[PDB]
Design a protein around this ligand. Structure first.
Ligand SMILES: [Mg+2]
Ligand SMILES: [Mg+2]
Ligand SMILES: [Mg+2]
Ligand SMILES: [Mg+2]
Ligand SMILES: [Mg+2]
Ligand SMILES: [Mg+2]
Ligand SMILES: [Mg+2]
Ligand SMILES: [Mg+2]
Ligand SMILES: [Mg+2]
Ligand SMILES: [Mg+2]
Ligand SMILES: [Mg+2]
Ligand SMILES: [Mg+2]
Ligand SMILES: [Mg+2]
Ligand SMILES: [Mg+2]
Ligand SMILES: [Mg+2]
Ligand SMILES: [Mg+2]
Ligand SMILES: [Mg+2]
Ligand SMILES: [Mg+2]
Ligand SMILES: [Mg+2]
Ligand SMILES: [Mg+2]
Ligand SMILES: [Mg+2]
Ligand SMILES: [Mg+2]
Ligand SMILES: [Zn+2]
Ligand SMILES: [Zn+2]
Lengths: 25, 214, 127, 97, 91, 97, 201
RNA sequence: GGUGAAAUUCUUGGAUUUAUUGAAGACUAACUACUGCGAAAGCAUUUGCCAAGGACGUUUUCAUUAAUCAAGAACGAAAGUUAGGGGAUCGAAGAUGAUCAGAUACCGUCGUAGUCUUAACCAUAAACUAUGCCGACUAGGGAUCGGGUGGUGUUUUUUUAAUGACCCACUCGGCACCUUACGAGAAAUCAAAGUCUUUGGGUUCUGGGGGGAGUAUGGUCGCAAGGCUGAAACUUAAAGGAAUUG
């Protein structure tokens, strides 16, 4: 997949894992 | 089944004094019925006619003129001055590459308290031995010429009543006076005023209006 | 000699306009356009239609007052193609060939000091 | 400029600052020119302008607030009026003033 | 010593009412308690009381202004657009 | 690899030029890279020139033309107008004809 | 209880030897000791009161009269004003635009005071807490606090009752509704979050 | 009206067209170029103001004050965020008309945020010349920009000049281009990417097969979005570059 769409893929993927992890702080 | 042409009137347009011919053309209005007649209803139009059709010769083929109509009397609607424009083809052919364009303008009044904004346009020319292909100015050239043209354009206006300013612009008295004060700065081919628009005029004064008719 | 009018041919793409008016502009006469003499919605500007539009247009011109008329051609302009459309050359031709006289035509296409961002966006109409 | 001229007076001439001492000078005819700040209230202005004409003294209306006039004389405080007792190397007394 | 990292005067409300509301207040509150330059007497002695009212400590002049600042941007331009129009009726 | 010393067109020593909009498809494109043609053409055309001066006042009167600039996005320039393509070295030829 | 400061402005009585004092709303910029001029022929300076006919277009005035002489109707709240947008010298009307955006046309004799009204921006500060609103309405009128009609029993309000808290029918009430019916969104010509640019055409 | 062609849409409300006149916000057309300026981003209407700057000129002054730089800091297209104002235009979103097997798109309509501005943030771009800075040397050519020097040069005539513009030769410092290649390179090409196995002028920075991965983790900045710093396990014999023939 295009570089910048892969860059966008792992951006959401990071944002969601950041999200899921904070349910635990 | 109306055909308002069976109902429209007709009117012949007369031009101001300082030109060659005064006969301009024809128009159509309506019947002068009471309660919204034909007189004070429109009459306040403009007609854009080339002054080479108003002066005959073709050394003025460009330079459109606007004639606003002020009054009317007995199938005769005299007109006065409203502005001057340039033909698009002429301008689009003055603006050639490989040279500098210079524009300037200034708002100004007159004795007859008309206010207007005259314009000016000029291009740089080559010296008649010049090797280099473009011949541009030096951006202080351009500033000085603008200030000088502006200095010149203010003396001619407020010099008595756009009527006489009408006389001033036709034979290009301004253009060569520009060429005079300019030549000590830069060659500058193609100087014209190129444009002037009216924006405010004083009260009607039916008297001074008829001061160019007979 | 003659009695003058103004032609003012707006000949853009997808249609052509003609209409004679009084030299003051305020009062007008005898318009009909190119979408009035053919029905296919794609030939609204084609010369075969702009001809028949100029045919009926010069008719009422002599049928009311005019013996001659100046012309002011015009394209879409503004921020558009700025070039004349197809049915402009035929319209002027098919009215000077009607018998009317032609005097001192210019082009009144609207040309700005560029602004008002053109439509179609940065990547342009892409097809 | 006018300030550059006032600067010349300050570094070579005699002067005084403040409303009370410029009247001491105006009564004794010692002042050659008084400078009046923009925001000085009119009553004081009209009062000095009377003293000044009885002294036959010229009056320069400084186009600036009393803060700027204090900077003009080169002081950190503010002054409402200046009085030139002796013009030094400057030409303020016989110039555009 | 720097006492608070961002709340400043707004620290009196402590944790209450939500950071953003406190932020908006802190701005106008700083706007409204401050000492301003006096047009008339050239000192910075203008202070407020009773939003709208601005009086000078000495020289005892009182100016009508904006609710939490002396000059408001609106009345500022209105000043100039009146200055402009006025000059149209002498020249 | 790199296939043009200009890289697309004409910008050395400038940094950023302002884009113009394509006269054909409105694609924005920098002015230095904005393949340009002057449109010089009479108002009348091939055959309408004789019919023009035939039923007309003003002996031949002027016949003036229309002028305007044209700006193409390379794609559109390649689709119709002066592009076509050149061999490896013919490209460098900047002669108009 | 008022947003804007007032301006006490004393005049001479042209008919009796006495001072007569008026109460103006303080237009921003006016100050103690200023001279206010009031009249047909009067300078176009902030603080003066002039008939709408006698100011150019673009003038920005407050406390303007609806009919001439009503001693001040429009543009009185802190921060408001009206702008003159044109004149009709025959019939001497003067078209203005009011703070709402409405464009009323009134007599050219109507009087307004040059400038805008002091105390602007007052509504940009959060009240931040109940008490501020308490002391606010304490010096206006007993309008605060507001029990929701949806928290009362039906005796009390159209919205009252139900085993859940809800309006139960459309809260848009017609103009022709009768007293005791009109509660909610009276004569609402539209509803919902106003998205898109406002600013009357 | 719009299109390849159509349709959604606009039309007794006189639509589209024309005419006179006004409002608002935006942009600066043509002149505009292998032309200018700034550290870069960037920068094109006039005029006034405000401070700034290189090049040149120089028989002026100081006299090693410098070169380059971890940390640190100033600026930093666009989009985006906060609070006002602005909201003409174009228009992420969304709704539509069409096309398509489908068509969440391409084309057409509507149009939210946005686009503009003030006050604050954000600090990223193929932010490009994909090419550090200071210094030296090494090769030919004609253009152009700025400054300067040379003239019994041309043109402006007033009465001969003075000027201004132009011409010719030179010399600094510019943006570039042309031909060569002694030379260099894997080549494409390159007066630097040259003066390197005949390997050393000063100095800063980064890279060490491909994925994993700019991911995890910690730190820190940010209102958010995200920025900077930044691994490993495991997997894999290729990935890649330039050129040649198909
Ligand atoms: Mg939880
Ligand atoms: Mg294509
Ligand atoms: Mg390639
Ligand atoms: Mg480029
Ligand atoms: Mg760039
Ligand atoms: Mg109560
Ligand atoms: Mg409640
Ligand atoms: Mg409530
Ligand atoms: Mg209950
Ligand atoms: Mg009930
Ligand atoms: Mg009910
Ligand atoms: Mg209920
Ligand atoms: Mg509920
Ligand atoms: Mg321009
Ligand atoms: Mg908008
Ligand atoms: Mg969609
Ligand atoms: Mg669909
Ligand atoms: Mg979608
Ligand atoms: Mg980067
Ligand atoms: Mg690049
Ligand atoms: Mg060389
Ligand atoms: Mg070789
Ligand atoms: Zn004071
Ligand atoms: Zn294109």
């Amino acid at each position: 997949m295009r570089a910048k769409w892969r860059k966008k893929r792992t951006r959401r993927l990071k944002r969601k894992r950041r999200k899921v992890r904070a349910r635990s702080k | 089944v109306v055909d308002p042409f069976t109902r429209k009137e007709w009117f012949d347009i007369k031009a101001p004094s300082t030109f060659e011919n005064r006969n301009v053309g024809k128009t159509l209005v309506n019947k002068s019925t009471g309660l919204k007649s034909a007189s004070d209803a429109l009459k306040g139009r403009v007609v854009e006619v080339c002054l080479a059709d108003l002066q005959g010769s073709e050394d003025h083929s460009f330079r459109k003129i606007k004639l606003r109509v002020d009054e009317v009397q007995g199938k005769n609607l005299l007109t006065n001055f409203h502005g001057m424009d340039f033909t698009t083809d002429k301008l689009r052919s003055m603006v050639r590459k490989w040279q500098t364009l210079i524009e300037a303008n200034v708002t100004v009044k007159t004795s007859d308290d008309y206010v207007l904004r005259i314009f000016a346009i000029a291009f740089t020319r080559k010296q008649a031995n010049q090797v280099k292909r473009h011949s541009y100015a030096q951006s202080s050239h351009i500033r000085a010429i603008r200030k000088v043209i502006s200095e010149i354009l203010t003396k001619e206006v407020q010099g008595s009543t756009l009527a006489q300013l009408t006389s001033k612009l036709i034979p290009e008295v301004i253009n060569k006076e520009i060429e005079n004060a300019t030549k000590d700065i830069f060659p500058l081919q193609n100087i014209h005023v190129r444009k002037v628009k009216l924006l405010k005029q004083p009260k009607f004064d039916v008297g001074a209006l008829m001061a160019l008719h007979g | 000699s003659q009695v003058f009018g103004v032609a003012r041919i707006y000949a853009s793409f997808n249609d052509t306009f003609v209409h004679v008016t009084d030299l003051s502009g305020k009062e007008t006469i005898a318009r009909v356009t190119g979408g009035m003499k053919v029905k296919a919605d794609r030939d609204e500007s084609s010369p075969y239609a702009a001809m028949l539009a100029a045919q009926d247009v010069a008719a009422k011109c002599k049928e009311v007052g005019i013996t001659a008329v100046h012309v002011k051609i015009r394209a879409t302009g503004g921020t558009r193609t700025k070039t004349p459309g197809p049915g402009g050359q035929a319209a002027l031709r098919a009215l000077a060939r009607s018998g009317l006289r032609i005097g001192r035509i210019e082009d009144v296409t609207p040309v700005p000091s560029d602004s008002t961002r053109k439509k179609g966006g940065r990547r342009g109409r892409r097809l | 400029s006018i300030n550059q001229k006032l600067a010349l007076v300050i570094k070579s001439g005699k002067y005084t600052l403040g409303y009370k001492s410029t009247v001491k000078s105006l009564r004794q005819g010692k002042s050659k020119l008084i400078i009046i700040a923009a925001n000085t209230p009119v009553l004081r202005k009209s009062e000095l302008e009377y003293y000044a004409m009885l002294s036959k003294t010229k009056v320069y209306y400084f186009q600036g607030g009393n803060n700027e006039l204090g900077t003009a004389v080169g002081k950190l405080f503010r002054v409402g009026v200046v009085s030139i007792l002796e013009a030094g190397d400057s030409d303020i007394l016989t110039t555009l003033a | 010593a720097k006492r608070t990292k961002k709340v400043g005067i707004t620290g009196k409300y402590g944790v209450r009412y939500g950071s953003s509301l406190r932020r908006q207040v802190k701005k106008l509150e700083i706007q409204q308690h401050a000492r301003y330059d006096c047009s008339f007497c050239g000192k910075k002695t203008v202070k407020r009381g009773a939003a709208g009212i601005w009086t000078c400590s000495c020289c005892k002049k009182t100016v009508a202004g904006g609710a939490y600042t002396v000059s408001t941007a609106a009345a500022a331009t209105v000043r100039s657009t009146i200055r402009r129009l006025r000059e149209m009726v002498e020249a | 690899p790199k296939k043009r010393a200009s890289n697309g067109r004409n910008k050395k020593g400038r940094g950023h030029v302002k884009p113009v909009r394509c006269v054909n498809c409105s694609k924005s494109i920098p002015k230095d890279k904005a393949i340009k043609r002057m449109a010089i053409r009479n108002i009348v055309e091939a055959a309408a020139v004789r019919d023009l001066s035939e039923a007309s006042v003003y002996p031949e009167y002027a016949l003036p033309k229309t002028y305007n600039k044209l700006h193409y996005c390379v794609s559109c320039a390649i689709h119709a107008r002066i592009v076509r393509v050149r061999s490896r070295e013919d490209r460098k030829n900047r002669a108009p004809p | 209880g008022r947003g804007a400061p007032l301006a006490k402005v004393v005049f001479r009585d042209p008919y009796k030897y006495r001072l007569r004092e008026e109460i103006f709303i303080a237009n921003e910029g006016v100050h103690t000791g200023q001279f206010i001029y009031a009249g047909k022929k009067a300078s176009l300076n902030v603080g003066n009161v002039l008939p709408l006919g006698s100011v150019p277009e673009g003038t920005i005035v407050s406390n303007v009269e609806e009919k001439p002489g009503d001693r001040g109707a429009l543009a009185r709240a802190s921060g408001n004003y009206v702008i003159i947008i044109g004149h009709n010298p025959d019939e001497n009307k003067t078209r203005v635009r009011l703070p709402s955006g409405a464009k009323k046309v009134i007599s050219s004799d109507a009087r307004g005071v040059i400038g805008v009204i002091a105390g602007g921006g007052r509504v940009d500060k959060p009240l931040l807490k109940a008490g501020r609103a308490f002391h606010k309405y304490r010096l206006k009128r007993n309008s605060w606090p507001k029990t929701r009609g949806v928290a009362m029993n039906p005796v009390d309000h159209p919205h009252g009752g139900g085993n859940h808290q809800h309006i139960g029918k459309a809260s848009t009430i017609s103009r022709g509704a009768v007293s005791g019916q009109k509660a909610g969104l009276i004569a609402a010509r539209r509803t919902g979050l106003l998205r898109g640019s406002q600013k009357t055409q």
